[PDB]
Symmetry: D3
């Protein structure tokens, strides 16, 4: 009857916050609420250090925090495949990977993201055109966000996205919360409480290892983001 | 040297959410960050049932939820005095109570709140004008908010507030947080996840007792908020 | 397999403009486009003069303009049944009348409207709270609007609406062109051209009979709208 | 008494939409309602294919759609001279061509356009500074727009425009329109109805010959706009 | 040839500020700028204390302040007629008075105001509908404002104003300054400097006679504004 | 107890306006109004011509106008040290010059400016980072503005500014004035009145020397601002 689905969220999780977790809760309620789907699992897949994003701290720290964060979740877990590859991995391959790992009525892996990432699809030389087509046509996208109209319009404004709109779901986040990783690192650098913005275990981990600082924010300064170096060379 | 202050946050807490706890964190960082204050304790004071606010479930439960939410707080505690009054009590009075209670240099009690409360000072018949005066003049008011300029403007537009502006500290909430009790109860009636929006013990306590629903939202329908009744009769 | 559906649009249509016609095109495309419905007919049902809406000219003229406006329409037609009733007719009863009429698998009658009409569900005493429930539950509502987030937010704020959410389809109008009747009447009072804002036949008809004036605009001036009368008597 | 004006609108009309026709009716009512002018003719002049604008279909088709759109216009007509020109023509040369054509009291030829075109005067290398001056100074510019306080701000910021302000008439479009050619093409590529957004004959012509597609949309892709080509070499 | 005009500004001038003076410079530059008018004089006409506007100090101080403000003006002067009547005087009358006094080619008197006043034409019972008609029909209105589009729209929305639009001139205040009398009194009450907001002499007359206070702001507290009493009795 | 401060405002004052003078009234009111500062002097320090800002007329005239503008001020004066420097001086140096001067308790010198200058800190290569740091840390900055949430946010978005937030006082301008020099020059070139936007003497001096024109606006056309030239060579 209903189609089973696995929500896969690729990201930097630098560091993970209640917001990324909350992203899962919302997508699940929505998907299960349509009556035509059953969300069987949530997978958080931290990006490997080969991504080179500014300030991106070492993967093990990010993976451990994301594990610490899901420890009390009953349906959301961390998968380390992508973080372990040596070369940065294109989200479409990370999707094809878990979709195949499942084939061994098979659950459909769908990409879970906020409007943020959905919109980078338009940044020049960031995403391969064929990648986007396959991602929305063969897996599906589930976009959670406050600016529901922005996202809806962004879709309307792209022929590929519009064509596969049946396979793309914008999920409104009426409870306006935005605990951005950037604001968190900022708060940390400035010695301010992030208590209640991230899970206590993550907060404790960050504290013990004294993660995030001016030094850390500088990692990868002046280094082009992996996806771009690829489409420029 | 520094003025020790106690942050008293009066409200319904129907139910307490991460946002209300976040409020104490912000205010603490801000007050200590000024260098001229030392925040020694936070006090969550739920409103007795005589308030009659629409949807207000029993005080005892709201008190229990606040204690649950603060089990793991080293400086924020709950105070039941207000919840025990047969007669709804005016915030000015609650403040006098705590200030007088503290005397037994003595820390100063300041009312912690959002811009929602500050602005309601202008709702007709809601607050006693002479009360607004002694609150800001004699105690103080720490107002946390996402719209700092509207709060600023609101203060500038009132001779009483402006005059005593040195006792009104507008605190900026750069991390967009809007976890309103109203949206929580709304999610609850619909069976949606409210995990990571409220502390877990609070979510668990609520799930267990089915505290929020259509029927509870109707409590006090047609009844006049206590303060308004008292200033019209 | 696919649900045959009929779009019924109740409204004053005083006068009908390219915009009301556009409503039918946008909705049909959407429904047909979701793959689960097949729009077979469009019905324009001008409200009866008993509505007593400020500026409402005689129904017969409004009916005829709707006829001219759809004279070339392959699928949209004009039904005079509601206008011919002596008493003002609630939309629920008109929906029933037309659904019952079709039953003589039968096609499902759905209410076609704009954000305007949807949000008026919240005007005190305007709609019976049960008529609303039966409309969204037993019939369905297709709401066309430029401000989609507002319409959706309106659904999210209403338990009843949110509850029958799967029967309420918000359709985005990306080609934002609000040719309101109010601006058409004003333009005619000032002798402006309204050509290309309404179908030529309607334009020509209006000029020939000199329909809109300061006079017609004063019709029902001071009379309380029919739905509000009923709900006060 | 009055000055007899002829409104010349140069543009691509790819394809012409109700809003373009609406442009003429708006301007005629405004110029005539000042009491000091008399609009005697409206001329639509489709740009030639040599303009190399992305997505621009053959002038043959744009001319014929412009003609069907105006077949029932008592005062607006189409002039094929600009399009039939092997070379792309500067608007100044087209204005001139038409003025001179008339002198063979002579009606003043004025440029009819939207805030769009007017604001493009600031696009580096798009318009020759002297051609701008000569258009506003020797011909006149009637700019229809929804954003009157932009067209106005733009004139107030250009010493040149401001100096000839008396010859630049900003006409307000109160019926918030937006039927852009881009959005019509997008809809046609998506097989969506455009009925009631353009004249029936144009709709029928476009449908019958499947004029707009992904293919047509790609015409000239990578080709620099004729004006930019000229002012850079 | 050119029409001579006298700009009459009816207002409370409580107190007058650089902005009121500014109003005249702006209007004069505009009227003269059109090339078809010649501004030969400006007239500031303080409202009589019979207006009963809350906080309105005595006419004599307002008149002396306005004369002091215009001491150095070569073309703007104060007329005391209005302020000298025992009965509050309808602006249409104040206009008729000055126009008749000029006939003693003959300069046309036109009312000079901000958007504030133009728009108050809508407030229920504030202006006798026939007065508005005569003012825009038989004299003319020059409205200076930062919100040129609002005034423009407000006119568009009024059949009366729109019909005589050729006699109404909206003049754009590009160098936005908004020294409202209200903010001046507020600043004064608070002991804040008003230097450089009003003319030095005015600023010095207020300092000398301690004109604005809490006390004064209360004048006419609870007294219905004169025009309102008249149109409700 | 209270700290004596001197407000130093570095800028072009090309030409000085009411607004620049306004800046000192506001800031003196704010600082003394905090109860912990005593503002003893205001200093207008016009920039030397070595600055090379486009359109900057000769130092001498700017200095004279500043003196005419402040002739009658009890506490605000003009210091020509910057105007007399052959090489453009970095604001830090000016601040250092005055501070040292005073030391011959000693008043603290603080930079007075608008949000405009503050935000210019992010213009690439405009200000030397070590300078920004030294200015906010060792001297102080009082920023006046109508968009103080933009200044508040700009401070919050920079670690250095945030780190020194205690030394940066954002002062709200509730009376909305944006009488910029650029708009004044635009008005003068167009022959419009600027009476009441600048003090009378200043306006009289500009009119007598015909200081601002198309020609003057061209000074330094094509030359890089001193600061930018320095940090790029
Ligand atoms: N407030 C908010 N509300 C709702 N969702 C929010 C959010 N803030 C972040 N999010 C979402 O959180 C998730 C993770 O956030 P964050 O830690 O910031 O993750 P971020 O660094 O933005 O992750 C970018 C991801 O895209 C992948 N990518 C980028 C570029 C090209 C290609 C390619 O295959 O060509 C792939 C990349 O490998 C990485 O997995 C995202 O889905 C983001 O949109
Ligand atoms: N998004 C947000 N960001 C920051 N702060 C936010 C917030 N949403 C709520 N808050 C704050 O959270 C706190 C608790 O909220 P909530 O639980 O909804 O509490 P609420 O019902 O708004 O609390 C009303 C309180 O005001 C008192 N009151 C009302 C009227 C007259 C008088 C009187 O003495 O005359 C006193 C009343 O006794 C009670 O203690 C408030 O201070 C609120 O402003
Ligand atoms: N720009 C725009 N974009 C998209 N849609 C737009 C629109 N402007 C109007 N519309 C829609 O066009 C349609 C016709 O509009 P208009 O001519 O103005 O018609 P209008 O007067 O708004 O029609 C109101 C209708 O609601 C019915 N009603 C009202 C209140 C209570 C009850 C009851 O049963 O209790 C029933 C009433 O009998 C009538 O049929 C509406 O659905 C309107 O919202
Ligand atoms: N919503 C709206 N409301 C009101 N008016 C609107 C409008 N959308 C477009 N318009 C107006 O409709 C008209 C037709 O638009 P569209 O079909 O898109 O025509 P478009 O491609 O924008 O036309 C450009 C025209 O400018 C000429 N041009 C461009 C650049 C440099 C020079 C030169 O001599 O140096 C000349 C060019 O030859 C062509 O005739 C325009 O005047 C446009 O602004
Ligand atoms: N920021 C700004 N930009 C441009 N103009 C601005 C302005 N602030 C005020 N102004 C203008 O300044 C002028 C004087 O300001 P202010 O002192 O505040 O004038 P205010 O008290 O608003 O003056 C009301 C005037 O209207 C008359 N009135 C009222 C109601 C009904 C009738 C009737 O005949 O039925 C007549 C009344 O007798 C009095 O002369 C006004 O024209 C105002 O709009
Ligand atoms: N509306 C408004 N409200 C409040 N204040 C306003 C204002 N408009 C301007 N102001 C303020 O007025 C003052 C003077 O205005 P204006 O004449 O336009 O001054 P402007 O030319 O913008 O002043 C530049 C100043 O910055 C210094 N600077 C620039 C770049 C790098 C460095 C360095 O050390 O590296 C120093 C420069 O030497 C000069 O003193 C400024 O503080 C400006 O922000």
């Amino acid at each position: 009857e209903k189609t089973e689905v696995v929500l896969l969220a690729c990201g930097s999780f630098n560091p993970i916050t209640n917001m990324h977790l909350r992203l899962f809760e919302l997508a699940k309620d929505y998907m299960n609420g349509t009556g035509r789907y059953t969300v069987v699992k949530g997978i958080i897949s931290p990006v490997g250090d080969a991504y080179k994003k500014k300030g991106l701290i070492p993967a093990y720290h990010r993976v451990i925090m994301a594990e610490l964060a899901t420890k009390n979740s009953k349906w959301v877990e961390v998968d380390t495949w992508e973080s372990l590859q040596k070369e940065w991995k294109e989200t479409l391959k990370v999707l094809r990977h878990h979709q195949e790992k499942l084939e061994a009525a098979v659950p459909k892996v769908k990409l879970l993201c906020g409007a943020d990432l959905l919109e980078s699809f338009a940044v020049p030389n960031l995403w391969k055109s064929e990648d986007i087509t396959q991602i929305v046509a063969n897996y599906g996208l589930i976009c959670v966000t406050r600016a529901g109209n922005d996202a809806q319009k962004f879709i309307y404004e792209s022929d590929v996205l519009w064509k596969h709109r049946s396979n793309i779901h914008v999920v409104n986040e009426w409870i306006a919360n935005d605990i951005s990783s950037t604001k968190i690192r900022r708060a940390l650098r400035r010695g301010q409480s992030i208590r209640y913005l991230v899970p206590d275990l993550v907060q404790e981990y960050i504290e013990k290892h004294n993660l995030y600082s001016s030094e850390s924010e500088d990692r990868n300064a002046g280094v082009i983001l992996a996806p771009l170096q690829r489409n420029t060379a």
